[PDB]
């Protein structure tokens, strides 16, 4: 698997945590892992897709904290 597939796999797990009302600390742990991983991947192979994946994870976490 390459970089975006690894992120998508984690994003699916993150969506599960949100839908099942997992504790916010668990949502944040995984969202922050995705954010850091996407930032590193973007520096290596820049793409609009990686920027959007990063933003999706940041937005999901922001909404989860509200």
């Amino acid at each position: 698997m390459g970089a975006v597939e690894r992120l998508a796999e984690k994003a699916y797990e993150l969506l599960k945590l949100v839908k099942e009302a997992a504790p916010l600390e668990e949502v944040k742990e995984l969202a922050d892992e995705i954010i850091a991983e996407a930032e590193a991947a973007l520096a290596e192979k820049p793409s609009v897709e990686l920027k959007v994946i990063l933003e999706l994870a940041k937005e999901l976490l922001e909404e989860a904290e509200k």
């Binding site: 975006v4 998508a8 994003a11 793409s47 609009v48 897709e49 994946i53």
Partner: protein, 65 residues
């Protein structure tokens, strides 16, 4: 512009569990030659049970083409 729209719509479809929309968006990314978007969307579709690993490989190949 359109890459971002496709990726965000796929994330929404994944959150809603809409396998048909995931496959439709996957088909769009593939036809338009968006490799990164194809790989990302194909993996969401695989995790959702909408496609198989062999189908994923074929979609990725077609997008690269």
């Amino acid at each position: 512009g359109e890459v971002e729209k496709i990726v965000r719509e796929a994330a929404r479809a994944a959150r809603e569990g809409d396998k048909e929309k995931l496959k439709e968006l996957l088909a769009e990314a593939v036809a338009k030659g968006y490799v990164e978007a194809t790989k990302f969307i194909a993996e969401l579709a695989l995790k959702a049970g909408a496609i198989t690993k062999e189908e994923k490989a074929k979609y990725i190949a077609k997008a690269e083409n």
